[PDB]
Amino acid sequence: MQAIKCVVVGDGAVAKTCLLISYTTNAFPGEYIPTVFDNYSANVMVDGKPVNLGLWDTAGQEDYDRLRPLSYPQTDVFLICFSLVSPASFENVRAKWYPEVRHHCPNTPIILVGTKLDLRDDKDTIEKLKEKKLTPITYPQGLAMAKEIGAVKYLECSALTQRGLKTVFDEAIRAVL
Amino acid sequence: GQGFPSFLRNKIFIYRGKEYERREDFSLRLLTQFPNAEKMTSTTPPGEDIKSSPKQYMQCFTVKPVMSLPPSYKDKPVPEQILNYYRANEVQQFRYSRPFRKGEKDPDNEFATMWIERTTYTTAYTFPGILKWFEVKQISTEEISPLENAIETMELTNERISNCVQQHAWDRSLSVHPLSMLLSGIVDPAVMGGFSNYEKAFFTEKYLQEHPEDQEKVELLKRLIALQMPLLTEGIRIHGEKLTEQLKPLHERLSSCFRELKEKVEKHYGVITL
Amino acid sequence: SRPILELKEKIQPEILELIKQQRLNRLVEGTCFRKLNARRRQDKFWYCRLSPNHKVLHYGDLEESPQGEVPHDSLQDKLPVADIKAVVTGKDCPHMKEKGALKQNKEVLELAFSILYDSNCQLNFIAPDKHEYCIWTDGLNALLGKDMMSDLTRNDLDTLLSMEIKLRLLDLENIQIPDAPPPIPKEPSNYDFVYDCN
Fold this sequence. Notes:
Chain A is of the alpha/beta class.
């Protein structure tokens, strides 16, 4: 047994906390119970030994960048998140989230994560993005940004499907290990 | 489905899974046990077509191990080991939470329609047993109001606080990171202000005309948050005992918001403390 | 050999399903396939077992096993047999298109196969040699339930059909088959068999 810090940020327009809570609950897709409190945690092994793990559910509102860095120190791994279907999310992460994280924490294994994987290939979502001239940005460019940081990994998933989500957390835990 | 074996056709079972299998891990291992491994998506209700159809169908998910009754233990301040052992074993009741939107789904207030149709299960035999699984011997469901679900959620939150305080109370060489977990998450219902939500949703007289007779539940909320407040106090105190240099800013925010909500319950909520 | 060949190729399918069945047996017994550029201490060999249910693919980064397949939980025991778009061969493999660190040399031109799934995930794998490369392409295409793209497969097809028809011609020794089939002697319209049935 042992505990692992795991900070997670990302804008509030993507509902990453839904991802976290669905994972922790081991709930059915689309059947999570939204709690009232943040900063989730669990205790599973990815390999060999069971370990505690704590997910610092952090609100992505930019103002709170005076409080969130106080959470940063001695964090084993951080998880940077976005929406695969929000170009604004990309601009924020490449422009604000990623740079400030690299600044505050220049020494920590990092994994980028996509979101709404189904909506990336959802015809209606992508046609809305085109009619609104937003880009249904695909994997290779997120991969390019991951190479830009050289993040130890990047994965993309969908909440309503949890596809690779369990895996996402598996590499997340093994990042410490 | 119909293609199941006789003892399997349109049957429900509960499996004493491994210690730390995730839902789909065990699910996939079971799929290995079987061909025609098509999984359902209406996880709670069955399929009448498949109540007669061939081409075996299945749906699997985690369920809640209902607490045993610790015999002759109902009041003693027994240490944790007893509790954790009975939290696992000699179990026969198994409930499954059932989310539901009942009423009007206002965007800012997901608590406006949370009605839990808590589905419980009784099986023949007590886990663990001579089989790592058993059929349900009897199913039952429930219905839970936002008032209610609020009640259980908050009180279980409080007792979780109590449990962490106690486990880090008997033991010293123990990471404070879980303390950060809790104290953070509770200190700011940041995504949704739970306490404020309860105030607006039930403490308001719009609700006490919505539930005049069921106002005796908002007083339940009041007494329960009142019992919560000192528990928060011991949480704060133990945090101070394990306070660190990253934690003093965190700690002071905890403390400020904590006595803030202290006065909020005492006068703004008007409740009486202990 | 005109009606002979008519009959021989006309009774095709039994050998076809036989060969395909053997191919499924082969995929099930499987072996350790090859990864991409597994040089700086990477398990180039890794078993890939098809289920006897023929629905899950017990594959993943298993060790440099000389024994080949070991029956256990691979890294990913599932490749969805139904949704596999195809497998790209040769240059159509995007890993063959890779010109960076995972640049596969021209000496594995025929060993390159990428199994298509999720429309963004590929299985850029390498065969130990061409014959089993074609064998596994044949096996997945049997999962696809289509024609077989192994030279050895057509070899076995033709040779076994040849022996089968060759053993067929035993009862017809010292006889000729008219290329126009012999005229069917007229069946009297009455089916009132004077001698009893059975």
